[PDB]
Design a protein around this ligand. Structure first.
Ligand code: CL
Ligand code: CL
Length: 162
């Protein structure tokens, strides 16, 4: 298992513009297009992302390219973030993937706000962190996915994904 396969399981793959769990237009492997209520605005962002008149549809290769770009951006965001970097640096490889997953879903800002959990993770207080992570809108809105990521931070194994 690795970050790509992990996120592929969590996000799925859809080749036509769809609405995510929050009702925002997305495409491919969890690639958010826009928070705007307008389908046209979404089609326009899709075309600009892929570089062609797509008509709201992407091919598999295109979706996978957006995915590679997004994972790369998530990592790079973490490394540039003063609150995130130190946590990431302190973690083992598996847990690092858990942190990337969270950033991919909610953004640098979103995750950087889990101040208390981040400190616990940095301290390697696994069970405590897991408890704190669960007291969040994130967990209440997408509990199955959140449980998978949490278990990952708790155990440092990929058991939740197997
Ligand atoms: Cl893009
Ligand atoms: Cl879920």
């Amino acid at each position: 298992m690795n970050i790509f396969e992990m996120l592929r399981i969590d996000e799925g793959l859809r080749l036509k513009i769809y609405k995510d769990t929050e009702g925002y237009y997305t495409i491919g492997i969890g690639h958010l297009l826009t928070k705007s209520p307008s389908l046209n605005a979404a089609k326009s962002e899709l075309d600009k992302a892929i570089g062609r008149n797509t008509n709201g549809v992407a091919t598999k290769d295109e979706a996978e390219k957006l995915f590679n770009q997004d994972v790369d951006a998530a990592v790079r965001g973490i490394l540039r973030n003063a609150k995130l970097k130190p946590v990431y640096d302190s973690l083992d490889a598996v847990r690092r993937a858990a942190l990337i997953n969270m950033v991919f879903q909610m953004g640098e800002t979103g995750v950087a706000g889990f101040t208390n959990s981040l400190r616990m993770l940095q301290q390697k207080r696994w069970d405590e962190a897991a408890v704190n992570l669960a007291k969040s809108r994130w967990y209440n809105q997408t509990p199955n996915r959140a449980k998978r990521v949490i278990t990952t931070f708790r155990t440092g194994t990929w058991d939740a994904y197997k």
